[model samples]
Target: RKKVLVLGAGYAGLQTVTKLQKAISTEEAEITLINKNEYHYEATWLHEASAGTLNYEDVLYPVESVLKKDKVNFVQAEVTKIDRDAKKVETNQGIYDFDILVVALGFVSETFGIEGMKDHAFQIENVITARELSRHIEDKFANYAASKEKDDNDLSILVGGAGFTGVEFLGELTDRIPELCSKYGVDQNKVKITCVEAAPKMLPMFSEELVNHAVSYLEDRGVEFKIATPIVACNEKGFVVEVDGEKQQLNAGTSVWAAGVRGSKLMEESFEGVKRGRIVTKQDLTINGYDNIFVIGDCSAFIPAGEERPLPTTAQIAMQQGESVAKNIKRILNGESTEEFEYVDRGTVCSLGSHDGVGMVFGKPIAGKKAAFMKKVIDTRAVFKIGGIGLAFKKGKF
Candidate 1:
């Protein structure tokens, strides 16, 4: 039997392993998945948890619950290095040699070389980080009410970047702050939520009208947006932004950088032609020279003909790639030709608070409560696809 090793239990890795287990028999291949943690959390829902809209625990579930013990073996270990030449992977527990390897290690926070931001700013990277951010913001509220000399900054939260993650987080904050104010016995008017974006506009993926809709929707709820202003750096007090060639500090009690993400660090370390930790793979999702080694998720990039760079990494793309890789691996194992990966661009959906949202389904614009309803359906579907109805009910936002 061939040894098939998979790294990370993220959407991409889990999808590949789960699909492969059912399609490939144990006699033909032995599948093993290695991840840093035993539990898998929904990366999409981390923003909600960070804003205290959802419990961090609700977004996470054990890896063992969905695995078939007879087919797939699970290892809880952090991957340290990849020795492609040796065809071996080094992990915290033990090294493993593989006949086939799948790299789907996911992404990390990108600070864009901003100083003090990394040290002072909170990032919604994982469950622990999300939980920490939520607690930090809530504590600020708690402290504001009890302190003798209260700082106004304690009621202010500064968010960097006005992208999907930034806006979604802001949406949750709008809903959460009122509840927080009521709990802390503080005036709602005193709490502040400001979003800073370097770009001239926000949500570049959406139409101008939709962007305006999302912006005004959140703005109506006391959210503030500083568009076209670039962030210079972060200080202990808050973020510093450049306006009219001048730098000014926006002091806040809590600061979060929901700016961007790059692929796994191991990708750049393992591959020679990696850019920003992402490797450009063949149409079949295999590395150029190595057929046995495949890269998926944020760690790999597949550039369609005529395109300069790969599309932005998303959970939907990662999940689709996972399915494609699973089938391709089976094809290779059976001495059959591999099929090219076909990425179907299904439009995007972003939730705004609990009741409002904006998205496009099949290139048609949808907004307000209808879009929000669709957002829940999409969220629920992701859970159902991974571990079926059982896991969906446990971890789904719907």
Candidate 2:
């Protein structure tokens, strides 16, 4: 029997763990899964939770619940280093050696060398960070009411990017703002939500029609679009951005950075030839220099044979990569050749809130309530993938 080590219990890692459990017979291999947390949560749901449209507890479940303990061993530990040459990985708890390794260590915030952002801006990249931002937003409102000054800036929300996260978070914030205003005795008009984007528009991945639909919906909900503005620096007060030909300051007590992301810093610190914490992967999702060491999820940057751009780092792609990796491992064990990964993009749907959305699905354009419903469907589908109907029914958004 061979020992296999999979790090990071994220979508990609979990998918591989769940599938590999049955892909190879238990007597032939010993599987070990490592992650820092004791539970698994939907990364896609962070924006909704950060805005407090959904409860924190609603987004996560025990990792043990989804595992087949008989076939897979789950280790809750922080991975410190990967010594590939020695075929061992060091963690906070212990050291491990493996015949095979899967790296799915997720993403981290990339400031793009912006000043003051690293120290002052809150990044909604993980559950803890999302929870922190949600609490901070609530506290700011309470502080406004408790103080004699009642600083309106405290109510101002500034997002540094208008990418999917920025747009989606702002959407949920709009829906939650009314409730916060009613609860905290602040006027809705005093609460300002601004989305600062460097591009001429938000969500360039979608069509102009869909982007227009999303922008108009957000605008009607009191979201200000500071489009075509590049951030120069961030501070406790707010951020400075280049507007027209001069630099201008925008003030907001609550500033969030949802702008750029690189693969996990662990990848950069540990591996060579890493571009922005991501390494170029072979068609089979394996790196060029490693044997029986594969990379998946946000860490592996794979551009197809003819395509100029690497596939977008999404749960769909990561899960698909997991499927392929599991099957490839099985084939290799059985004395067969590996297969190239073929991506099947079902579609993309960006929520404008819990009840509204827009995007393209199945090569057809969708908007309004239909797209919103599709977003929920996609979320439930991912839930069902890791576990089953029981997990989906218990945690799925209806």
Candidate 3:
């Protein structure tokens, strides 16, 4: 009998565990999944929650429901270290041994050593953070209405980065500000939403026409954009944005860091092979130095031949890798050579509230209301992939 141990019940980990459970039943092999939190959240939807568009609970499903203890034993614990040679994993709760180990711990906020950004900036990293930010922004508006002697800048919100995550959040924020202003009995004219991007433009990957259209869409809703501005630091006071040493003080009620993410910190402390805390595994998703250990999702990087880096960090890629790893792990147990991971690019989709967005399906560009419709389908399809139409029926749409 062999034992399969999985770390992190995120997109990749959950997918792998579910596939393995389906492939093998009533077997001598035992399966176990470890995760830090009890609930698994749809990471993509965190931006929506941060903007107050969706409740945090809507984007989260319990790990128990997804893992289904009958199919896999879900271990709620925090992994502290991993010893490949000893074949043992040390966690806050206890120790575990395995014939096969999968690492899918996922990524964390990378502060880039900015002076005060880390201490002051809000990040949409998890459900809790997103919900907290939403509450913070709403609270600021509430206070603004009640305060009789405050500056106009008290209601300003500054968002860093114009990437996918930032733009999506901006869209949500723009929508929420109006509703919040009304609730607080504040003049909407006093509120400000500025999306600052270090790059020259927002949505760098989108076509110029699409980007222009998207910018106009946001602009119509009173979202301000400042391109090519670099943020130097942040504090309880505000951010100091810079351009060629010229600095401007930005007093924001909230400053969100949507710049980037790095691999899990646990990986950095646990293993020698962590490339910036990210694992570069073999096609079978197994770690290079050890056979029993495998890595998946954003926590691991897989470089295809002729490529400079691994696939982009995305839920679609993570979910697909999860499926591939499950099949490969079964093959390894059966003494078969694991197949190389071949990533199928399904294009990308980003939502702009519930009525607008931009995405490409099968290499075809989609935007406006159609893009929004497709984004919903993409989400519904994830449900279809994970637990079939029945699960989709119960928890598919808003």
Candidate 4:
């Protein structure tokens, strides 16, 4: 029997597998999924967990629990490299040979060569990091409460990157800071949460009016914004950032890298025409020279309709691409011509601290409780997609 191998098991990879499983008979094609872990977590909601607004279980669900064991085989291992010409993926455990390979391997934190960045900064890019960040921050708060000589800087939180993840984290962190201070017996007034965004304007896509409104809201909640400042170095003690030629130093127990991302390094030296650690692919989601091997999500770039540039790295786009890739592959297997992949833009939502958020959907801007409620529903639906409504009812929300 011909084998179908799907890699990554992320938003794109897992969704592709789920759809492909339903498309063909188990006998016609033997489906195998390769992932880094046994359970799949919602990548979008990890920021909430990192901010202490939610827990790890809120964003995680067992991949085996959702996938039918008899129909699909799940292999958990890291793929070291992918040899396109040979049509096999090499991992630490073993090599996987695929008749048709679906490369859904997700992204990695692109440190951009910032000095001491990779070694010192934390990224809320995955489950492990999120858990570590949550504990680290909580430990700091606890230690500050117990210490007689508490430095105001010890309770200070330095968040790098003013993008979606940074902003959402700030929202939740600011909301939780008061509670943490109360539990730790520390004064809330002494604590500081600073967000440094390299861009002159925060949320470049947001309207000017909405941007101002968001700034006022976050400011009222004690979140400081440092715009147009680039980071220089980070260390165990603190970080040094570059702002207008002068260097500024800030101390914090935690530093998070939410700035940039690049595709899988597996394709960098293995395949030709790999640029900036990202493998460029055709709209059909296939590599340039290889027809049998396809890539999607953060691992590969896909240009969307009505846009000059490729779609941004977001869970929404990845999940959509994953489903489309599966349907197209199924059609190809049955000797049917594959269809062109089109991305449907569903607008954007950003969660503020606690039960507040700013939402821009269908070109309309909304904020406050309604937006956050929408964000929660969207998050719940994301889990439901993988494990159905049962998972939604069980380990859904926090």
- Each model's backbone clash number: 0, 0, 0, 1
* Winning candidate number (lDDT): 1
Against the hidden reference, what TM-scores do the models get? 0.98, 0.98, 0.96, 0.95
lDDT of each candidate versus the true structure: 0.90, 0.89, 0.83, 0.80
Scanning candidate 1 in windows of ten residues, the lowest lDDT window is 389-398
Write down the RMSD of candidate 3 (Cα, Å): 1.5
Tens digit of per-residue lDDT, candidate 2, span 1-38: 88889988899999998888877898888889999999
Per-residue lDDT for 1-398 in model 4, tens only?
67788988888899888878877777778878998887887888877788777878767777887776767889989888877778788888899898888888777788778887788887877889888888988898988877888877778888888777778888888778888889989888888888887778787767777777678888888888889987888888667888787998878777888877887777686767776566667788888777777788888778765667777888888888888888877887887877778888787788887677777877689888878777877777767776678888886653
Query: After aligning candidate 2 to the native by TM-score, how far in Å is the CA of 154 from where it should be?
Result: 0.5
Ranking by TM-score: 2, 1, 3, 4
Error of 2 at 101 (Å): 0.6
> Where does candidate 3 stray beyond 4 Å?
68-71
Return the clash pairs for model 1, or none: none
Please report how far candidate 4 places residue 68 from its true position, in Å.
Answer: 3.1
lDDT of 2: 0.89
TM-score attained by model 1:
0.98
lDDT of 1 by residue, 1-398 (tens): 99999999999999998889889987999999999999988999988999999988888899988898988889999999999889999998999999999999999988888899889999978999999999998999999989998787899999999999999999899889999999989888887889999989799889988998898998888889998999989989999999897999999999999878889889988987998779999888899889999899989888866678797889998999999989998998999999888889888788899888888998899998898888888888888888999788867765
